[PDB]
Ligand binder design. Structure first.
Ligand SMILES: *[C@@H]1O[C@H](CO)[C@@H](O[C@@H]2O[C@H](CO)[C@@H](O[C@@H]3O[C@H](CO[C@H]4O[C@H](CO[C@H]5O[C@H](CO)[C@@H](O)[C@H](O)[C@@H]5O[C@H]5O[C@H](CO)[C@@H](O)[C@H](O)[C@@H]5O)[C@@H](O)[C@H](O[C@H]5O[C@H](CO)[C@@H](O)[C@H](O)[C@@H]5O[C@H]5O[C@H](CO)[C@@H](O)[C@H](O)[C@@H]5O)[C@@H]4O)[C@@H](O)[C@H](O[C@H]4O[C@H](CO)[C@@H](O)[C@H](O)[C@@H]4O[C@H]4O[C@H](CO)[C@@H](O)[C@H](O)[C@@H]4O)[C@@H]3O)[C@H](O)[C@H]2NC(C)=O)[C@H](O)[C@H]1NC(C)=O
Ligand SMILES: *[C@@H]1O[C@H](CO)[C@@H](O[C@@H]2O[C@H](CO)[C@@H](O[C@@H]3O[C@H](CO[C@H]4O[C@H](CO)[C@@H](O)[C@H](O)[C@@H]4O)[C@@H](O)[C@H](O[C@H]4O[C@H](CO)[C@@H](O)[C@H](O)[C@@H]4O[C@H]4O[C@H](CO)[C@@H](O)[C@H](O)[C@@H]4O[C@H]4O[C@H](CO)[C@@H](O)[C@H](O)[C@@H]4O)[C@@H]3O)[C@H](O)[C@H]2NC(C)=O)[C@H](O)[C@H]1NC(C)=O
Ligand SMILES: *[C@@H]1O[C@H](CO)[C@@H](O[C@@H]2O[C@H](CO)[C@@H](O[C@@H]3O[C@H](CO[C@H]4O[C@H](CO)[C@@H](O)[C@H](O)[C@@H]4O)[C@@H](O)[C@H](O[C@H]4O[C@H](CO)[C@@H](O)[C@H](O)[C@@H]4O[C@H]4O[C@H](CO)[C@@H](O)[C@H](O)[C@@H]4O[C@H]4O[C@H](CO)[C@@H](O)[C@H](O)[C@@H]4O)[C@@H]3O)[C@H](O)[C@H]2NC(C)=O)[C@H](O)[C@H]1NC(C)=O
Ligand SMILES: *[C@@H]1O[C@H](CO)[C@@H](O[C@@H]2O[C@H](CO)[C@@H](O[C@@H]3O[C@H](CO[C@H]4O[C@H](CO[C@H]5O[C@H](CO)[C@@H](O)[C@H](O)[C@@H]5O[C@H]5O[C@H](CO)[C@@H](O)[C@H](O)[C@@H]5O)[C@@H](O)[C@H](O)[C@@H]4O)[C@@H](O)[C@H](O[C@H]4O[C@H](CO)[C@@H](O)[C@H](O)[C@@H]4O)[C@@H]3O)[C@H](O)[C@H]2NC(C)=O)[C@H](O)[C@H]1NC(C)=O
Ligand SMILES: *[C@@H]1O[C@H](CO)[C@@H](O)[C@H](O)[C@H]1NC(C)=O
Lengths: 832, 833
């Protein structure tokens, strides 16, 4: 079985780079705290005990309010009068750093105005190993450069708005099946521990870890560790991924929190680099915690050093001060668990004072404008045989497909969006928000048609093919809507347990398109989906005259689409994944059956870096629509490639901050009423064993604490660490590349130039993306696009050196409009 | 068994009143015709043989194109790029003569621009005897005065736009059950003939005939006779209703056409007053006709007098010239039977040249604006506890009910509207049109809320009550949409065979309303329906803060409603029928079982004139919402009622003939002519009349089957009640002027609908009967004097001994006010005669 080697001790924060100020303030405040106050910072108060999906108790003596952590990466979850933004995969399709940032900002503002201190997003894990993974749509793209940049911009947007962002899920949570034992049991499978992602050291560095290096470097304040194991050690106590890769090598200064039920031990996780337990209890409402009381006892009894808990408290406070949260603090002014105005203060046990729990604060501002724009700028025009834009003069318009229409249960009518009914604007699970409303394609396109005095209808039953065919025969243009949905693994829709069972259009989508195209010579297909779908059966039908993929557009869906179809917005989006002819063309099969008896299923990432386009390229398979493909209402020319060559070894000892007293200091205080199921930091009595209630208390302790796990002395700095997101020399700029881009067509719009490198060597992909931008040019206008390649951009990870090295194989650079349209290339000069 | 006495001969046209000129042109052109040409005008060419749902062959030698007849009373049926107008019941609810006129003009324009000569509408039969009748919605109101006035304005709108209107269905077709023998068989009922409406002479004069008098007097060119029998004589050969009441008493100068399959004999129908056979064959595509060949033969063999067929020709051409159709003539430029651009000329057999059958002409103009306004102006505000209008500042708006949402098969996705899916904007059957689009309440309300930056959702599955209750608990206002549908009898939706099986909301509507009102203190109910529904279980819920009935609004439905809800239009509409506590409170049960063995079911109108509010008032039963009731966003005051007393041939000419009839050999099929399969022609196979007729009863007991007087072309007496248009002209003398002051006493501009009722007195007269109304726009504080006049007809009763209208000696009173139960002003009327 794959094995996860140890790396200890858990590195302590040190004020690195842009953290210096936040760190000194954290140390100043944590130095005033008692042990039970520190522990209150690290442990949630119990599932549904307070307002937010995650909430800690804070430190009231020092005026630090409990920290409220809320989903999702696309808008506030379980709340009211908030916006519902396009999913992260739509951000990836924009290839637009500025939009990623603005969406970040607009979300952080909404969260902040609800009294939420930490947003649980953005996501870059799953990166998107498999096309049918149930949660890729929450993240960005299976390409690490594209994902890393937009993930970092999203983070900066959210944090500049005063809310701590949480880069999740760390790491290798690439499929929903078998991610949690109790879930798998509900789906008929008996496993003793969750699926283990087994991954070699080079692949993890070059693919899955790279966007987390970007997030660290961009200043992200929190990381959420994952439910799956990595080489059979759970994500939230994997000393190699958390202590070595995240903290020692990437130099992460913020705090790591568990996913909800991902916490699996007290001492083991604390020493393997976890900082925050969510939602705080061992299972929901168990009234027990691996930390809380137990972490106070673990320090008192000598097993967890004081420097470890002190460092947890310092990382947590520093992330809070780093985004300025203290200046914006207010208690959460809504409840995740009810929409009632009044309720008991502590929801799950219905205890505490009966008082106002919801204030109905409308935090939307004018964010519907950035949503509508981001939806239009993420609508990829995959095919256009001279059909779009429409003029508004088409005499009779057929709107065809359930995906154009309303959810008959209401837009929020399926809990956590766990159904596929009506237009698909948001996929399912915890990665969701309540729509304030949902503009459907039927609404926006019919309103556009009626504004020009046209005739228009919508057919939204995909088995009503008799009606579809009759109307398609009468129409000037048929706009056909289809979808494919997926989501987090605790919800199953039509037998898809989070992950998609296939890549085919749902609700009869292929038969619908053929019914319409067989009968109307101007049939235009619009796809809303979580990821790629198979288009092979109809994409080259001679009456399918255009095809668009609009992703998961959020609340302004129909308006974002009508803007594109009627030429108000010239589509500039590019596919952020590959569109293959078959499911087999992508390889990388999900693990769907137990392969390790009733032990943890074993998920070997045996393709290495070869996922999405790298895998297609290596197999010489031609995609229908490649990574980076998308059309425009204008054309662009790329010419004139120009290349120019450009000109701590030990840590401190672990500090302690403040003092730890006798057990009687930490016994429940006398006048306090303990709320049922509420998780506290306090002990029932000075008897440590009885107060822990742990059946393993004090047994074989030293044998269960890895070697080095308590060592507070100065540590070596890793060759690849020493900076933020890696050794700073990885970020030196070695080569400048420039090209001329001209708009040669007749419509103003945006080009997305893309720069790929060939690193060389028998095991390297043919091309890997490194740089891109999105540049606005009016007709005939030109501009020089210039960018630089960093030492990291030209390196591979070398397992013998434990460092990035520029290998001696000759390297090339390529510039053009997609991974398969690269008219400009050059050999790169040797650099090191 | 009820018996229908004979009245013969069938009166001939005479150029009465405004028909003088059209009649002179008709005689001049018909005087040039041969017998086979005249026959061609009276007979359709067979089901689906040409373009229009009925079409004659015309008279090509004299450049008279075939007449194209097309449904429906609310917009062009079976066509493209046309508008879908609100139903006739909505026009009733507007109480607005001007809107009725403007809707008739917008429709006539559209029909004319498609090459259609005759619109098959508007409808005042069924009048609305039973609240669950399947086609009341196509007509206006169970009240004869309200109906007759808006029917007449609708006809003047259509005809002033250059298309012949057809007043239908004449007469007493007050239910769909047992209306046609083959339809009844399709439903498991074995009957030998159609249901017989059996009605006394005074009720038919005072109720069902009255709007047809107004139609005739307003100039209607055509009348369509009905499928039912009346006293066991078929509506399209009933000499009493056709010859006596319509032609001799009301003085009708235009032509009578059959309903489709309502023609039941050649000789008998022609003598009893029918003028045109539709669609022309005996049964669809039977290639046989009671007329066509048979009518040419019936004149040749002496059974039907030449003057009778000359008169059919003269009435048909006169209706055509009267509206000026000859000046707008063009072949129908669409096909009812296919939307294809090209097709065989003759659809049913797929024969004739292969040529252009559709030109896709867009005839809609800006008719959406009159549709939008008439939908808003027909939305009756039944209850409003200071809930409406909305301001747009409502923070969260719940739109609840399938009736708010789209039809998942597309607006036209159910053939002839035969389903109740999504919002109900048009009921079912032949009285239908293709929507060019349909704006749903969901669309227009959600767009309104978004313009204000509110939050809004629509739940459109009426059994998703968990989601309904959860959203309603969150909502500032819950707008709940419910409906009840019905239509022509040839379609059955959910076991409703045209007629509605009950008056209860469809699709779980009562439960949906309770789910919302139990959870939301500001629940507003919007009803789309063909007629009244039972509101008793929830209308007085303390959380139901407003209730509206918006009828069947046609293609602008959601915009018409949003205009009212957000106060761009202050509702002025008034209920045109009564909302009772129970079905039993209306009486007037439909006949739903065979009650005459396997012969015609017998439908006795034993309540007489006591239908709708007359019945409630006679029984002292209190409606929840009375006839005439509607609220407004302002209030009106009525004061100062005052009354002021104000200051014909006896024989016809002899029946004329125009032009000549020759030998049988003149009428044999022309040798150079390809005879299209199923097409109906006027020609004879040979000079052998018996053989050419193919009639198994040819020459059988003929004299016995020709009623006494049926061939009598001599001068006839003029009936005491006849001699004018819509009756003896002395019936229209104005005898009393009434005036009252109407004031807007509230804070916003709005329309009042003052209503003038009379009590005619007598032990068996209704307590009150509507006679006058108008719809008057007033700004806040503004006052106006409303003046109208009562005619001699308005004060009379039908006296069956006299066969005339008489003002009886019981003292009469006038009552003016805002509804049939809210009449604060009353005056005794002085004796007048
Ligand atoms: C001061 O106060 C403190 C607070 O109260 C006291 O704290 C308690 O101390 C106890 C010890 O005194 C702790 O109990 C022991 O816990 C260990 C750790 O269990 C967790 O981690 C397991 C993985 O361990 C590796 O990885 C972590 C880091 O991730 C390391 O910390 C470990 O040292 C170990 O490292 C090796 O491996 C990694 C790579 O993976 C390398 O990198 C390293 O170099 C090392 O090689 C993990 O598997 C555990 O998962 C179980 O528990 C989860 C629920 O918690 C459950 O979800 C999982 O499915 C799994 O369930 C199964 O096992 C549990 C029992 O652990 C059963 O109850 C359950 O039925 C299932 O069987 C977990 O997340 C734990 O291993 C110990 O248990 C082993 O040993 C005891 C005997 O001593 C046996 O009785 C047990 O069966 C078990 O035996 C297995 O393991 C042995 C290998 O070690 C092997 O020999 C056996 O054959 C068998 O395979 C103890 O349970 C307790 O956690 C802690 N409490 C709190 C609140 O923190 C403290 O004691 C006190 N101090 C003093 C001085 O008084
Ligand atoms: C870890 O995080 C957790 C979660 O956030 C922290 O747990 C919370 O800690 C709070 C203390 O910081 C504790 O707050 C208490 O709440 C009680 C309930 O308050 C609500 O109800 C009351 C009463 O109806 C309303 O007034 C109030 O506004 C709330 O709606 C309060 O009643 C407690 O008030 C008392 O203490 C505060 C100061 O803490 C005083 O200012 C206040 O006057 C009260 O003082 C009396 O009681 C205290 C001790 O209870 C005595 O010391 C004092 O002398 C007074 O005693 C008189 O009155 C009491 C009865 O009231 C009488 O018995 C006595 O004989 C005297 O006559 C306080 O406000 C939260 O409840 C608690 N949350 C939960 C879920 O448990 C935890 O602290 C964090 N841990 C660390 C280490 O940081
Ligand atoms: C009752 O109503 C019914 C239904 O409306 C009436 O029935 C219709 O009557 C029409 C009038 O007679 C009759 O029309 C005939 O249609 C034929 C076919 O028309 C179409 O297809 C052809 C063939 O592909 C196309 O070419 C044509 O354009 C149409 O698309 C025609 O072939 C007949 O046309 C001729 O006669 C008329 C006079 O009516 C001329 O004006 C016209 O120009 C044609 O003229 C030639 O034919 C006549 C012989 O009648 C000659 O006298 C003349 O000099 C021309 O001669 C040359 O050409 C002919 C024919 O090719 C040739 O044989 C000769 O030697 C010369 O070379 C005519 O148009 C409809 O078919 C019929 N509809 C149905 C469904 O049956 C009915 O009449 C009404 N009854 C009454 C009593 O009013
Ligand atoms: C990949 O992954 C996807 C996602 O998980 C998989 O998709 C599922 O595929 C299943 C297997 O194919 C799908 O299940 C099938 O669904 C069919 C349709 O179900 C729905 O629609 C029907 C038909 O509705 C019409 O008729 C109704 C009245 O009967 C009417 O109300 C409705 O409005 C429609 O009206 C039109 O049609 C009638 C005439 O038919 C006209 O009169 C009318 O005017 C209109 O024109 C409805 O009956 C049904 O209840 C439902 O709403 C079912 O039809 C399938 O049934 C066939 O097989 C049955 C058992 O399997 C058997 O009973 C029966 O005999 C049938 O032959 C079947 O349930 C499922 O929906 C898909 N799910 C999604 C989310 O898309 C996919 O399989 C995977 N692909 C691969 C390759 O693995
Ligand atoms: C008239 O002649 C046609 C053509 O032969 C024949 O088919 C039809 O049946 C005949 N009609 C009658 C009544 O005999």
């Amino acid at each position: 079985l794959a094995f996860s080697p140890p790396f200890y001790p858990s590195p302590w924060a040190n004020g690195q780079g842009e953290w210096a100020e936040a760190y000194q303030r954290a140390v100043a405040i944590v130095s005033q705290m008692t042990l039970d106050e520190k522990v209150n910072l690290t442990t949630g108060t119990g599932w549904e005990l307070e307002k937010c999906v995650g909430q800690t108790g804070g430190v009231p003596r020092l005026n630090i309010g409990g920290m409220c952590l809320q989903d999702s990466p696309l808008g506030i979850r379980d709340s009211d009068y908030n916006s519902a933004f396009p999913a992260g995969v739509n951000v990836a399709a924009t290839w637009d750093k500025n939009l990623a940032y603005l969406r970040g900002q607009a979300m952080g503002q909404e969260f902040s105005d609800k009294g939420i201190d930490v947003q649980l997003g953005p996501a870059a894990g799953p990166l998107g190993r498999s096309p049918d993974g149930g949660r890729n749509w929450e993240g960005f793209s299976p390409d690490p450069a594209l994902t890393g940049v937009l993930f970092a911009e999203t983070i900066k947007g959210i944090q500049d708005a005063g809310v701590v962002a949480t880069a999740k899920h760390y790491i290798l949570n690439e499929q929903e099946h078998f991610r949690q034992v109790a879930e798998a049991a509900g789906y008929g499978f008996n496993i003793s521990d969750t699926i283990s992602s087994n991954v070699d050291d080079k692949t993890i560095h070059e693919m899955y870890l790279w966007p987390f290096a970007d997030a660290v470097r961009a200043g992200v304040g929190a990381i959420m560790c994952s439910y799956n194991q990595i080489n059979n050690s759970y994500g939230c106590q994997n000393s190699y991924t958390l202590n070595k890769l995240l903290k020692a090598e990437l130099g992460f200064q913020g705090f790591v929190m568990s996913d909800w039920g991902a916490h699996h031990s007290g001492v083991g996780s604390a020493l393997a680099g976890l900082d925050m337990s969510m939602p705080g209890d061992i299972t929901f409402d168990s009234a027990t915690s691996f930390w809380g009381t137990n972490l106070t006892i673990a320090v008192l009894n000598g097993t967890v050093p004081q420097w470890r808990v002190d460092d947890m408290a310092v990382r947590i406070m520093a992330a809070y001060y780093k985004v300025g949260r203290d200046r914006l603090y207010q208690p959460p002014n809504f409840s995740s668990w009810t929409r009632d105005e009044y309720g008991f203060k502590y929801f799950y046990p219905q205890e505490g004072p009966y008082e106002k729990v919801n204030h109905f604060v409308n935090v939307q501002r004018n964010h519907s404008e950035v949503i509508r724009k981001l939806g239009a700028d993420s609508t990829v025009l995959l095919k256009n045989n001279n059909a779009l834009p429409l003029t508004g003069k088409e005499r009779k318009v057929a709107i065809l497909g359930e995906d154009a229409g309303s959810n008959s249960y209401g837009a929020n009518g399926c809990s956590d969006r766990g159904c596929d009914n009506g237009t698909l604007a948001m996929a399912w699970g915890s990665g969701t928000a309540e729509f304030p409303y949902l503009v459907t394609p039927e609404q926006a396109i019919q309103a556009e048609v009626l504004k020009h005095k046209g005739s228009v209808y919508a057919i939204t039953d995909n088995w009503a093919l008799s009606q579809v065919e009759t109307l398609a025969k009468q129409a000037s243009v048929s706009l056909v809507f289809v979808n494919s949905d997926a989501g987090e693994g605790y919800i199953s829709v039509d037998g898809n347990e989070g992950d998609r069972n296939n890549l085919t259009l749902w609700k009869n989508g292929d038969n619908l398109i053929k019914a319409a195209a067989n009968n109307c010579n101007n049939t235009i297909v619009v796809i809303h989906s979580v990821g790629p779908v198979l288009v092979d059966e109809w994409y080259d039908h001679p009456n399918v005259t255009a095809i668009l993929w609009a992703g998961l557009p959020g609340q302004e869906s129909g308006n974002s689409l009508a803007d594109v179809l009627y030429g108000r917005v010239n589509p500039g989006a590019k596919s952020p994944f590959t569109w293959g002819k078959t499911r087999e063309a992508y390889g990388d099969y999900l693990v769907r059956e137990l392969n390790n008896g009733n032990g943890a299923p074993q998920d070997d990432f045996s393709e290495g870096v070869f996922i999405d386009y790298r895998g297609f390229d290596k197999r010489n398979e031609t995609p229908i629509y490649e990574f980076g493909h998308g059309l425009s209402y204008t054309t662009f020319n790329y010419s004139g490639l120009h290349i120019q060559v450009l000109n701590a070894t030990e840590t401190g000892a672990a500090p302690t901050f403040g003092q730890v007293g006798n057990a009687s200091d930490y016994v429940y205080p006398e006048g306090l009423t303990r709320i049922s199921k509420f998780i506290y930091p306090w002990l029932n009595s000075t008897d440590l064993k009885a107060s822990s209630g742990d059946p393993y208390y004090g047994v074989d302790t030293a044998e269960h604490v890895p070697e080095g796990a308590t060592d507070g002395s100065p540590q070596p700095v890793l060759p690849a660490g020493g900076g933020s997101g890696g050794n700073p020399r990885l970020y030196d700029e070695l080569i400048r590349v420039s090209v001329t881009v001209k708009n040669t067509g007749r419509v103003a719009g945006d080009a997305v130039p893309q720069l790929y490198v060939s690193l060389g060597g028998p095991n390297e992909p043919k091309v890997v993306l490194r740089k891109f931008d999105r540049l606005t040019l009016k007709p005939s206008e030109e501009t020089v696009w210039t960018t630089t390649l960093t030492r990291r951009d030209l390196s591979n990870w070398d397992v013998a050196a434990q460092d990035w090295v520029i290998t001696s194989y000759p390297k090339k650079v390529h510039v053009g409009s997609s991974s398969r349209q690269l008219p400009l290339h050059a050999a790169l000069p040797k650099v090191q």
